[PDB]
Scaffold this active site. Structure first.
Site, PDB file in Angstrom:
ATOM      1  N   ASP A 163      62.409 108.888  15.392  1.00  0.00           N
ATOM      2  CA  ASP A 163      63.424 109.388  14.429  1.00  0.00           C
ATOM      3  C   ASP A 163      64.324 108.263  13.905  1.00  0.00           C
ATOM      4  O   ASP A 163      63.826 107.213  13.493  1.00  0.00           O
ATOM      5  CB  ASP A 163      64.222 110.523  15.078  1.00  0.00           C
ATOM      6  CG  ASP A 163      65.054 111.310  14.079  1.00  0.00           C
ATOM      7  OD1 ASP A 163      64.467 112.079  13.269  1.00  0.00           O
ATOM      8  OD2 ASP A 163      66.310 111.141  14.101  1.00  0.00           O
ATOM      9  N   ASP A 192      55.020 118.014  15.255  1.00  0.00           N
ATOM     10  CA  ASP A 192      56.266 117.726  14.550  1.00  0.00           C
ATOM     11  C   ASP A 192      56.082 117.584  13.047  1.00  0.00           C
ATOM     12  O   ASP A 192      55.968 116.477  12.531  1.00  0.00           O
ATOM     13  CB  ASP A 192      56.973 116.484  15.087  1.00  0.00           C
ATOM     14  CG  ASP A 192      58.282 116.229  14.361  1.00  0.00           C
ATOM     15  OD1 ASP A 192      58.826 117.223  13.824  1.00  0.00           O
ATOM     16  OD2 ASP A 192      58.730 115.068  14.326  1.00  0.00           O
ATOM     17  N   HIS A 228      59.006 117.308  18.172  1.00  0.00           N
ATOM     18  CA  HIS A 228      59.730 116.213  17.554  1.00  0.00           C
ATOM     19  C   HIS A 228      60.241 115.217  18.605  1.00  0.00           C
ATOM     20  O   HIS A 228      60.029 114.001  18.486  1.00  0.00           O
ATOM     21  CB  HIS A 228      60.909 116.744  16.744  1.00  0.00           C
ATOM     22  CG  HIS A 228      61.761 115.659  16.176  1.00  0.00           C
ATOM     23  ND1 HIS A 228      61.396 114.916  15.070  1.00  0.00           N
ATOM     24  CD2 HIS A 228      62.932 115.148  16.610  1.00  0.00           C
ATOM     25  CE1 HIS A 228      62.339 114.017  14.830  1.00  0.00           C
ATOM     26  NE2 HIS A 228      63.284 114.143  15.746  1.00  0.00           N
TER      27      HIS A 228
HETATM   28 CL   LIG Z   1      67.926 113.468  10.784  1.00  0.00          CL
HETATM   29 CO   LIG Z   2      65.841 112.877  11.893  1.00  0.00          CO
END
Ligand SMILES: [Cl-]
Ligand SMILES: [Co+2]
Ligand SMILES: [Cl-]
Ligand SMILES: [Co+2]
Ligand SMILES: [Co+2]
Ligand SMILES: [Co+2]
Ligand SMILES: [Co+2]
Ligand SMILES: [Co+2]
Ligand SMILES: [Co+2]
Ligand SMILES: [Co+2]
Ligand SMILES: [Co+2]
Ligand SMILES: [Co+2]
Ligand SMILES: [Co+2]
Ligand SMILES: [Co+2]
Ligand SMILES: [Mg+2]
Ligand SMILES: [Mg+2]
Ligand SMILES: [Mg+2]
Ligand SMILES: [Mg+2]
Lengths: 308, 308
Positions: free
Chosen positions: A123, A249, A278
């Site tokens: 991420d 994800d 995720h």
């Molecule tokens: Cl985000």
């Molecule tokens: Co993000």
């Protein structure tokens, strides 16, 4: 900037987290000194495996990966982004920008003089971590990307946009609940409480609130130009560059293709699909640690550099 | 593309030019095969000193530099840009773009598999050559920039704009006359004739006519984005990077500062100011050759890379 600091009592008694805190003071261009937290486990004569978290998690996300790698004799370093974990937290959403995060973590990286790094990023850990690779490529011996990207304002990203709109419409952001919603396995109350620990009330969450809005998904977004430039550096990055995206994800799935298309270091490594959501670190920590352990072992026989 | 090829009779009997032509066929995306010329002198076991010319010159500009370096035992390579010299010449101004030149010369560089390069670049030789460095940085052991730049559409460049407007208003472009106007010393008729040699009539000059219009001096110009990205690579280029701009060229003088500000490889080398005009190679060829000779000799004791 006005800055909040979470009291240390919040980090006592957390499930599977006893790692001693380390701190670094970085000074913003506006003169504000921000304290950033990281953990650093294992022998200093070993190259650091750098584990970077994203939104709205903290280094706690890597607690099992850290334990597994330390047991295998590695050095492991895991920092908390400003706004998160045990790091300081600017008090206004408008204080946070993508470029500010990059500047903060660039200062952190240089001040701790980390080199020979094997990076695992996920991420925003990758949105920021990959900018560190592009700024300081010789500091990195290998990179693993999982459920991340380096957006340049192009195409549609409807999976992410669904999360974006929710994250902006909601009046409150229940962090443990979000972590559980983004993991295939059911997190315990203790684990969710550890994710809530950085945030005694909503006033500590301004970095967590704005992060989704900073992702450059339109051509007009801040940091589009800087990310396009960073991609030109990644087009030259020929050391091992592994993709390890997960299977479940849809927010980030589309982020993998550009690495395989553009980064030369993806050619002579095996890529894998990890099981999980995720926050894949909660679903497949043992597999992540095994991947990183094997990656480190193979470096001398892979393409590598000298004299940095 | 319709393509012109200058007859070989034009290159007979040129003052101080007897170097045998070498050719490479590169294919454009539109399917057109273009023939590019270069000279290659000296031993193939020596690293190539790559000399790149700009607008509206050709490898002839380096004839004395080549002779001096060859006498000192070096390998020297000097190509003609498409539109120039003994290279093929697309017939329409609109056929030439900055990105096309970069693609053509990138193909040339890869197909000739030049490595361990010490680059000397001037004018468009640098606008294109520095894009080669940013695309293929490990092919370059050192870079010298003189009277050149890598524009990104920023600020004013009134020296250059004065030339731009002239170059576009004039109905004809007298090439030998331009070379003489951009050199402190008075070029002989024979030397001017060698600069006219590639262009039997105006129809061969379309690349020479449009080149100034391709320089990205406004934010809306083509190649601004690509050049900004290339600068991010140059911000990581830590091998010797020498500036050798001349004293009497207001067209390009302002181009030097950004290299010193942004490129790490400029820190541990000595920079110099050469005597002469825009086409400094006509004014200070011996000094250029001495600079390059000394630069090559010092490489093992300077920062260098391995395994490419
Ligand atoms: Cl985000
Ligand atoms: Co993000
Ligand atoms: Cl020009
Ligand atoms: Co202090
Ligand atoms: Co420690
Ligand atoms: Co390499
Ligand atoms: Co994959
Ligand atoms: Co080695
Ligand atoms: Co053929
Ligand atoms: Co030859
Ligand atoms: Co020019
Ligand atoms: Co280096
Ligand atoms: Co100078
Ligand atoms: Co060495
Ligand atoms: Mg769950
Ligand atoms: Mg091991
Ligand atoms: Mg003159
Ligand atoms: Mg020598």
């Amino acid at each position: 900037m006005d800055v909040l600091r979470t009291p240390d009592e919040r980090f006592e008694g957390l499930a599977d987290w006893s790692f001693a805190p380390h701190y670094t003071e970085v000074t913003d261009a506006d003169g504000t000194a921000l304290r950033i937290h990281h953990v650093d486990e294992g022998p200093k004569d070993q190259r650091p495996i750098l584990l970077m978290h994203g939104e709205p998690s903290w280094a706690y996300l890597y607690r099992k990966v850290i334990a597994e790698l330390v047991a295998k004799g590695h050095r492991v370093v895991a920092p908390d982004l400003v706004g998160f974990g045990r790091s300081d937290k600017p008090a206004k959403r408008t204080d946070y920008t993508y470029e500010r995060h990059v500047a903060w973590m660039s200062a952190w990286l240089e001040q701790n003089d980390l080199k020979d790094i094997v990076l695992f990023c996920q991420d925003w850990g990758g949105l920021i971590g990959l900018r560190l690779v592009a700024a300081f490529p010789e500091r990195f011996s290998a990179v693993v990307v999982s459920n991340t990207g380096l957006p340049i304002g192009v195409g549609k990203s409807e999976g992410f946009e669904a999360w974006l709109n929710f994250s902006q419409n909601t009046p409150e952001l229940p962090v443990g609940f979000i972590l559980n919603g983004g993991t295939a396995r059911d997190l315990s109350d203790a684990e969710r409480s550890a994710y809530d620990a950085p945030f005694p009330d909503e006033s500590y969450k301004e970095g967590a609130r704005i992060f989704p809005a900073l992702v450059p998904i339109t051509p007009e977004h801040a940091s589009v130009e800087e990310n396009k430039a960073a991609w030109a550096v990644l087009e030259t990055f020929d050391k091992p560059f592994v993709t390890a995206f997960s299977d479940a994800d849809p927010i980030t799935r589309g982020g993998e293709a550009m690495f395989l298309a553009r980064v030369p270091g993806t050619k002579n490594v095996a890529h894998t699909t990890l099981k999980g959501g995720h926050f894949v670190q909660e679903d497949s920590p043992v597999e992540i640690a095994a991947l990183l352990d094997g990656l480190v072992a193979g470096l001398p026989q892979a393409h590598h550099h000298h004299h940095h």
